[PDB]
Protein backbone atom coordinates (compact mmCIF):
# COMPACT_ATOMS: atom_id res chain seq x y z
CA UNK A 1 0.00 0.00 0.00
CA UNK A 2 2.35 2.60 1.07
CA UNK A 3 4.93 0.63 -0.78
CA UNK A 4 3.51 2.46 -3.98
CA UNK A 5 2.88 6.29 -4.73
CA UNK A 6 1.37 7.93 -7.49
CA UNK A 7 0.97 11.79 -8.89
CA UNK A 8 0.32 14.23 -11.37
CA UNK A 9 2.53 15.45 -13.91
CA UNK A 10 2.55 17.78 -16.05
CA UNK A 11 5.36 19.14 -18.68
CA UNK A 12 7.29 21.01 -16.04
CA UNK A 13 8.02 17.51 -14.64
CA UNK A 14 8.83 16.12 -11.32
CA UNK A 15 9.65 13.74 -8.94
CA UNK A 16 7.90 10.78 -7.30
CA UNK A 17 9.24 8.67 -4.22
CA UNK A 18 9.03 5.91 -1.91
CA UNK A 19 10.27 7.45 1.36
CA UNK A 20 13.20 5.38 3.19
CA UNK A 21 14.02 2.52 -0.27
CA UNK A 22 16.14 5.09 -2.21
CA UNK A 23 13.59 4.24 -5.39
CA UNK A 24 12.57 7.47 -6.99
CA UNK A 25 11.26 8.01 -10.60
CA UNK A 26 12.34 11.44 -11.92
CA UNK A 27 10.13 12.75 -14.75
CA UNK A 28 12.10 15.90 -15.86
CA UNK A 29 10.97 18.99 -17.80
CA UNK A 30 9.59 18.16 -21.31
CA UNK A 31 9.29 14.57 -20.50
CA UNK A 32 5.12 15.05 -20.51
CA UNK A 33 3.86 16.66 -23.94
CA UNK A 34 3.44 20.57 -23.17
CA UNK A 35 -0.07 20.81 -22.25
CA UNK A 36 -0.44 17.65 -20.69
CA UNK A 37 -1.10 15.71 -17.80
CA UNK A 38 -0.32 12.43 -16.75
CA UNK A 39 -1.26 10.12 -13.58
CA UNK A 40 2.03 8.23 -12.67
CA UNK A 41 2.52 5.66 -10.12
CA UNK A 42 5.57 3.91 -9.00
CA UNK A 43 5.89 0.76 -6.84
CA UNK A 44 8.25 -2.06 -5.40
CA UNK A 45 7.28 -5.36 -5.73
CA UNK A 46 7.36 -8.35 -3.73
CA UNK A 47 10.60 -9.50 -2.79
CA UNK A 48 10.01 -13.10 -4.17
CA UNK A 49 8.52 -12.06 -7.42
CA UNK A 50 12.02 -12.45 -8.89
CA UNK A 51 12.65 -15.70 -7.20
CA UNK A 52 13.58 -17.39 -10.85
CA UNK A 53 15.99 -14.48 -11.22
CA UNK A 54 18.02 -15.98 -8.39
CA UNK A 55 19.72 -19.11 -9.04
CA UNK A 56 23.55 -20.25 -9.07
CA UNK A 57 25.63 -17.89 -10.18
CA UNK A 58 22.82 -15.26 -10.88
CA UNK A 59 21.62 -12.61 -8.45
CA UNK A 60 19.28 -9.83 -8.27
CA UNK A 61 20.78 -6.58 -7.29
CA UNK A 62 18.26 -4.29 -6.99
CA UNK A 63 14.00 -4.07 -5.60
CA UNK A 64 11.85 -5.04 -8.42
CA UNK A 65 10.06 -2.21 -9.31
CA UNK A 66 7.14 -0.92 -11.25
CA UNK A 67 6.44 2.36 -13.02
CA UNK A 68 3.35 3.08 -14.98
CA UNK A 69 0.91 3.14 -16.61
CA UNK A 70 2.48 2.45 -19.70
CA UNK A 71 1.65 3.73 -22.92
CA UNK A 72 2.20 7.03 -22.12
CA UNK A 73 4.20 9.34 -24.62
CA UNK A 74 6.96 10.34 -23.07
CA UNK A 75 8.75 13.08 -25.47
CA UNK A 76 12.22 13.15 -23.41
CA UNK A 77 13.24 10.09 -20.95
CA UNK A 78 12.87 9.70 -17.41
CA UNK A 79 15.14 8.67 -14.50
CA UNK A 80 14.22 6.04 -13.06
CA UNK A 81 16.88 5.33 -9.33
CA UNK A 82 17.17 2.12 -7.42
CA UNK A 83 19.81 1.38 -4.89
CA UNK A 84 21.47 -1.91 -5.23
CA UNK A 85 24.11 -4.27 -2.91
CA UNK A 86 26.98 -4.69 -5.73
CA UNK A 87 30.63 -4.14 -4.80
CA UNK A 88 31.00 -2.36 -8.38
CA UNK A 89 34.32 -1.65 -8.67
CA UNK A 90 35.79 -4.65 -7.35
CA UNK A 91 35.49 -8.49 -8.85
CA UNK A 92 34.27 -8.94 -12.44
CA UNK A 93 30.01 -8.73 -12.73
CA UNK A 94 28.07 -9.08 -15.42
CA UNK A 95 25.02 -6.30 -15.35
CA UNK A 96 21.84 -6.75 -16.46
CA UNK A 97 18.64 -4.50 -16.72
CA UNK A 98 15.74 -6.93 -17.05
CA UNK A 99 11.96 -5.87 -17.03
CA UNK A 100 8.92 -7.78 -16.88
CA UNK A 101 6.22 -7.32 -19.76
CA UNK A 102 3.73 -10.05 -17.99
CA UNK A 103 3.97 -11.57 -14.34
CA UNK A 104 6.93 -14.03 -13.86
CA UNK A 105 8.02 -13.78 -17.15
CA UNK A 106 11.87 -11.53 -17.58
CA UNK A 107 13.75 -10.76 -20.52
CA UNK A 108 16.88 -8.89 -20.87
CA UNK A 109 16.87 -4.86 -21.83
CA UNK A 110 20.40 -4.75 -21.75
CA UNK A 111 23.85 -6.66 -21.02
CA UNK A 112 25.82 -3.35 -19.23
CA UNK A 113 29.03 -2.75 -21.99
CA UNK A 114 26.32 -4.23 -24.88
CA UNK A 115 24.81 -0.62 -25.04
CA UNK A 116 23.59 -0.44 -28.80
CA UNK A 117 21.98 2.78 -30.74
CA UNK A 118 19.04 1.17 -30.15
CA UNK A 119 19.46 0.35 -26.35
CA UNK A 120 16.28 2.36 -24.74
CA UNK A 121 17.81 2.92 -21.57
CA UNK A 122 20.95 3.96 -19.75
CA UNK A 123 22.00 2.37 -16.17
CA UNK A 124 24.18 5.43 -14.50
CA UNK A 125 25.78 2.84 -12.83
CA UNK A 126 27.27 4.16 -9.34
CA UNK A 127 28.71 2.88 -5.62
CA UNK A 128 25.35 2.12 -4.09
CA UNK A 129 22.43 2.73 -6.50
CA UNK A 130 21.60 3.05 -10.20
CA UNK A 131 19.51 6.19 -11.92
CA UNK A 132 18.65 4.71 -14.77
CA UNK A 133 17.75 7.08 -18.17
CA UNK A 134 14.34 5.51 -19.50
CA UNK A 135 12.48 5.87 -22.72
CA UNK A 136 9.38 4.24 -21.08
CA UNK A 137 7.81 2.96 -18.05
CA UNK A 138 7.51 -0.50 -17.12
CA UNK A 139 8.49 -3.12 -14.80
CA UNK A 140 12.62 -3.60 -13.94
CA UNK A 141 15.19 -5.00 -11.73
CA UNK A 142 18.82 -4.47 -11.94
CA UNK A 143 20.37 -7.96 -11.63
CA UNK A 144 23.94 -9.56 -11.43
CA UNK A 145 25.88 -12.89 -12.18
CA UNK A 146 29.77 -14.34 -11.72
CA UNK A 147 31.66 -16.59 -11.41
CA UNK A 148 34.66 -14.70 -9.94
CA UNK A 149 35.99 -15.52 -7.21
CA UNK A 150 36.58 -11.65 -6.81
CA UNK A 151 32.77 -10.50 -6.85
CA UNK A 152 31.47 -9.21 -3.84
CA UNK A 153 28.09 -7.87 -2.45
CA UNK A 154 26.91 -5.15 0.41
CA UNK A 155 25.12 -6.85 3.18
CA UNK A 156 23.54 -4.96 6.22
CA UNK A 157 23.38 -6.98 9.66
CA UNK A 158 20.54 -6.22 12.22
CA UNK A 159 19.47 -7.32 15.26
CA UNK A 160 16.41 -7.75 16.85
CA UNK A 161 15.12 -8.73 20.49
CA UNK A 162 11.34 -8.55 21.86
CA UNK A 163 10.21 -5.39 23.71
CA UNK A 164 8.49 -7.61 25.86
CA UNK A 165 9.89 -10.35 27.61
CA UNK A 166 7.59 -12.28 30.71
CA UNK A 167 8.91 -15.51 29.80
CA UNK A 168 12.39 -17.14 30.62
CA UNK A 169 12.97 -17.62 27.61
CA UNK A 170 14.56 -14.83 25.12
CA UNK A 171 15.17 -14.37 21.82
CA UNK A 172 17.47 -12.42 19.26
CA UNK A 173 16.58 -12.36 15.54
CA UNK A 174 19.87 -11.63 13.61
CA UNK A 175 19.01 -10.52 10.10
CA UNK A 176 21.82 -10.67 7.18
CA UNK A 177 20.14 -8.50 5.09
CA UNK A 178 20.91 -6.56 1.19
CA UNK A 179 22.75 -3.56 2.11
CA UNK A 180 19.69 -1.33 0.43
CA UNK A 181 17.29 0.70 2.21
CA UNK A 182 14.50 -0.63 1.39
CA UNK A 183 15.63 -4.30 2.49
CA UNK A 184 16.38 -2.62 5.94
CA UNK A 185 12.30 -0.88 5.67
CA UNK A 186 11.07 -4.17 4.98
CA UNK A 187 12.74 -5.67 8.29
CA UNK A 188 11.54 -2.56 10.54
CA UNK A 189 7.89 -3.37 9.11
CA UNK A 190 8.00 -7.44 9.81
CA UNK A 191 9.70 -6.69 13.58
CA UNK A 192 6.81 -4.35 14.34
CA UNK A 193 4.52 -6.88 14.08
CA UNK A 194 6.57 -9.15 15.65
CA UNK A 195 7.09 -6.82 18.53
CA UNK A 196 10.37 -6.51 18.14
CA UNK A 197 12.80 -3.63 18.31
CA UNK A 198 16.53 -2.95 16.81
CA UNK A 199 18.59 -3.59 19.45
CA UNK A 200 21.80 -1.68 17.87
CA UNK A 201 22.64 0.19 14.28
CA UNK A 202 23.28 -2.34 11.76
CA UNK A 203 26.51 -3.07 10.50
CA UNK A 204 27.78 -3.31 7.18
CA UNK A 205 29.33 -6.96 5.80
CA UNK A 206 31.10 -8.02 2.34
CA UNK A 207 30.22 -10.98 0.83
CA UNK A 208 32.44 -12.70 -1.37
CA UNK A 209 31.51 -14.92 -4.45
CA UNK A 210 33.60 -18.25 -2.37
CA UNK A 211 31.14 -20.27 -2.19
CA UNK A 212 31.57 -19.90 1.51
CA UNK A 213 28.63 -20.07 4.09
CA UNK A 214 27.76 -16.74 6.55
CA UNK A 215 28.63 -18.52 10.62
CA UNK A 216 26.47 -16.59 13.18
CA UNK A 217 27.35 -17.48 17.01
CA UNK A 218 26.81 -16.07 20.48
CA UNK A 219 29.84 -15.59 23.17
CA UNK A 220 30.83 -14.36 26.58
CA UNK A 221 27.05 -14.85 27.76
CA UNK A 222 26.76 -14.51 31.03
CA UNK A 223 26.83 -18.37 32.34
CA UNK A 224 25.84 -17.61 35.97
CA UNK A 225 22.38 -16.30 34.92
CA UNK A 226 22.13 -16.89 31.20
CA UNK A 227 22.24 -19.82 28.75
CA UNK A 228 21.64 -20.59 25.16
CA UNK A 229 18.84 -23.24 24.28
CA UNK A 230 20.73 -24.54 21.21
CA UNK A 231 23.29 -27.26 21.22
CA UNK A 232 24.83 -26.09 17.68
CA UNK A 233 27.76 -23.77 18.61
CA UNK A 234 27.18 -21.70 15.94
CA UNK A 235 24.89 -21.36 13.25
CA UNK A 236 25.05 -20.81 9.40
CA UNK A 237 23.42 -19.54 6.34
CA UNK A 238 23.98 -21.61 2.95
CA UNK A 239 25.91 -19.36 0.65
CA UNK A 240 23.49 -19.89 -2.04
CA UNK A 241 21.00 -18.12 0.19
CA UNK A 242 23.74 -15.09 0.90
CA UNK A 243 24.67 -14.64 -2.49
CA UNK A 244 21.41 -14.73 -4.94
CA UNK A 245 19.29 -12.30 -3.40
CA UNK A 246 14.87 -12.57 -3.43
CA UNK A 247 14.95 -14.01 -0.22
CA UNK A 248 12.22 -11.80 2.07
CA UNK A 249 14.36 -10.87 5.67
CA UNK A 250 17.28 -13.87 6.15
CA UNK A 251 17.73 -14.16 9.31
CA UNK A 252 18.96 -17.05 12.50
CA UNK A 253 17.44 -17.20 15.76
CA UNK A 254 19.12 -17.75 18.92
CA UNK A 255 17.28 -18.58 21.95
CA UNK A 256 18.22 -17.97 25.58
CA UNK A 257 16.96 -18.72 28.92
CA UNK A 258 17.01 -16.96 32.12
CA UNK A 259 17.41 -18.83 35.64
CA UNK A 260 15.09 -16.20 36.92
CA UNK A 261 12.88 -12.49 35.53
CA UNK A 262 15.44 -10.87 38.50
CA UNK A 263 18.01 -11.09 35.23
CA UNK A 264 16.57 -7.87 33.11
CA UNK A 265 20.10 -7.49 31.41
CA UNK A 266 21.60 -9.29 28.48
CA UNK A 267 25.36 -9.00 27.52
CA UNK A 268 27.28 -10.87 24.99
CA UNK A 269 29.05 -10.70 21.68
CA UNK A 270 27.48 -12.05 18.48
CA UNK A 271 29.68 -12.77 15.89
CA UNK A 272 28.49 -12.75 12.15
CA UNK A 273 31.26 -13.63 9.38
CA UNK A 274 31.92 -14.83 6.18
CA UNK A 275 34.13 -18.21 6.26
CA UNK A 276 37.11 -17.60 5.15
CA UNK A 277 35.85 -13.84 4.40
CA UNK A 278 34.87 -10.41 6.62
CA UNK A 279 33.20 -10.60 10.02
CA UNK A 280 31.39 -8.41 12.39
CA UNK A 281 30.94 -8.13 16.18
CA UNK A 282 28.26 -6.96 18.34
CA UNK A 283 28.59 -6.22 21.67
CA UNK A 284 25.21 -6.60 22.37
CA UNK A 285 23.86 -5.06 25.92
CA UNK A 286 19.95 -4.70 26.43
CA UNK A 287 17.03 -4.88 29.02
CA UNK A 288 14.58 -6.90 29.85
CA UNK A 289 6.49 11.25 -2.07
CA UNK A 290 5.82 14.47 -4.83
CA UNK A 291 8.00 16.87 -5.59
CA UNK A 292 6.68 19.32 -9.17
CA UNK A 293 8.57 21.30 -11.11
CA UNK A 294 9.86 23.25 -11.33
CA UNK A 295 10.80 23.33 -7.46
CA UNK A 296 11.84 19.61 -7.29
CA UNK A 297 14.89 21.02 -9.19
CA UNK A 298 18.32 22.09 -8.34
CA UNK A 299 18.90 23.90 -11.31
CA UNK A 300 16.44 26.52 -12.22
CA UNK A 301 15.40 26.46 -16.09
CA UNK A 302 16.80 29.57 -17.30
CA UNK A 303 20.74 28.18 -15.91
CA UNK A 304 19.65 24.85 -17.62
CA UNK A 305 19.06 26.34 -20.78
CA UNK A 306 22.16 28.46 -20.68
CA UNK A 307 24.60 25.37 -19.77
CA UNK A 308 22.47 23.17 -22.49
CA UNK A 309 22.40 25.69 -25.16
CA UNK A 310 26.65 26.30 -24.58
CA UNK A 311 27.28 21.96 -24.19
CA UNK A 312 25.26 20.72 -26.93
CA UNK A 313 26.80 22.21 -29.47
CA UNK A 314 29.48 19.83 -31.39
CA UNK A 315 32.96 20.69 -30.39
CA UNK A 316 36.38 20.03 -32.50
CA UNK A 317 38.47 19.61 -29.45
CA UNK A 318 35.66 17.27 -27.78
CA UNK A 319 34.93 19.95 -25.37
CA UNK A 320 31.41 19.98 -25.12
CA UNK A 321 29.13 17.43 -23.45
CA UNK A 322 31.19 14.34 -24.17
CA UNK A 323 33.56 16.10 -21.93
CA UNK A 324 30.99 16.96 -19.41
CA UNK A 325 30.14 13.59 -19.09
CA UNK A 326 33.75 12.12 -18.79
CA UNK A 327 33.96 14.91 -15.55
CA UNK A 328 31.22 13.46 -14.16
CA UNK A 329 31.90 10.13 -14.49
CA UNK A 330 28.78 9.62 -16.41
CA UNK A 331 30.82 8.03 -19.68
CA UNK A 332 30.76 4.55 -19.79
CA UNK A 333 28.27 5.11 -22.90
CA UNK A 334 28.23 8.12 -24.26
CA UNK A 335 25.91 7.24 -27.47
CA UNK A 336 22.75 7.50 -25.65
CA UNK A 337 23.14 10.94 -24.79
CA UNK A 338 24.67 11.34 -28.57
CA UNK A 339 20.85 10.73 -29.66
CA UNK A 340 18.99 12.50 -27.90
CA UNK A 341 17.73 16.46 -29.37
CA UNK A 342 19.86 17.68 -25.93
CA UNK A 343 22.23 15.59 -24.87
CA UNK A 344 23.45 18.13 -22.26
CA UNK A 345 19.92 18.16 -20.51
CA UNK A 346 19.45 14.27 -20.52
CA UNK A 347 23.08 14.81 -18.94
CA UNK A 348 21.86 17.38 -16.61
CA UNK A 349 18.59 15.00 -15.48
CA UNK A 350 21.27 12.23 -14.38
CA UNK A 351 22.79 15.06 -12.64
CA UNK A 352 19.85 15.93 -11.03
CA UNK A 353 18.75 12.31 -10.21
CA UNK A 354 22.31 12.16 -8.53
CA UNK A 355 22.22 14.90 -5.95
CA UNK A 356 18.60 13.17 -4.41
CA UNK A 357 21.78 11.21 -2.64
CA UNK A 358 25.25 12.55 -2.20
CA UNK A 359 26.65 15.03 -4.44
CA UNK A 360 26.72 19.18 -4.40
CA UNK A 361 25.90 21.81 -6.90
CA UNK A 362 29.91 22.15 -6.88
CA UNK A 363 30.57 18.85 -8.58
CA UNK A 364 28.87 20.72 -11.60
CA UNK A 365 30.63 24.08 -11.14
CA UNK A 366 33.82 22.36 -10.84
CA UNK A 367 33.07 20.29 -14.21
CA UNK A 368 32.53 23.59 -16.04
CA UNK A 369 35.70 25.04 -14.54
CA UNK A 370 38.09 22.29 -15.43
CA UNK A 371 36.39 22.53 -18.74
CA UNK A 372 37.68 25.78 -19.71
CA UNK A 373 33.92 26.75 -20.18
CA UNK A 374 32.23 30.87 -19.68
CA UNK A 375 33.01 32.02 -16.27
CA UNK A 376 29.36 33.31 -16.31
CA UNK A 377 28.15 29.65 -16.41
CA UNK A 378 30.25 28.83 -13.67
CA UNK A 379 28.95 31.50 -11.53
CA UNK A 380 25.89 30.31 -12.14
CA UNK A 381 26.06 26.63 -11.21
CA UNK A 382 28.24 27.26 -8.38
CA UNK A 383 26.85 26.44 -4.43
Request: a negative charge; one cysteine or more.
Amino acid sequence: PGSSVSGTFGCLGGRLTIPGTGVSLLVPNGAIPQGKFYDLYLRINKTESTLPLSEGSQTVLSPSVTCGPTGLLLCRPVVLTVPHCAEVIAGDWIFQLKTQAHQGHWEEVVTLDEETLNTPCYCQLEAKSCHILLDQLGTYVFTGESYSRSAVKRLQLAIFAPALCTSLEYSLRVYCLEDTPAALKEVLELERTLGGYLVEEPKPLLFKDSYHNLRLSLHDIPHAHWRSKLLAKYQEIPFYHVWNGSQKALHCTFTLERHSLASTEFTCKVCVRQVEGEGQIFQLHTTLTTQLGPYAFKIPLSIRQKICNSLDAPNSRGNDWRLLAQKLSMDRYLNYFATKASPTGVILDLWEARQQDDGDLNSLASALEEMGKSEMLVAMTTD
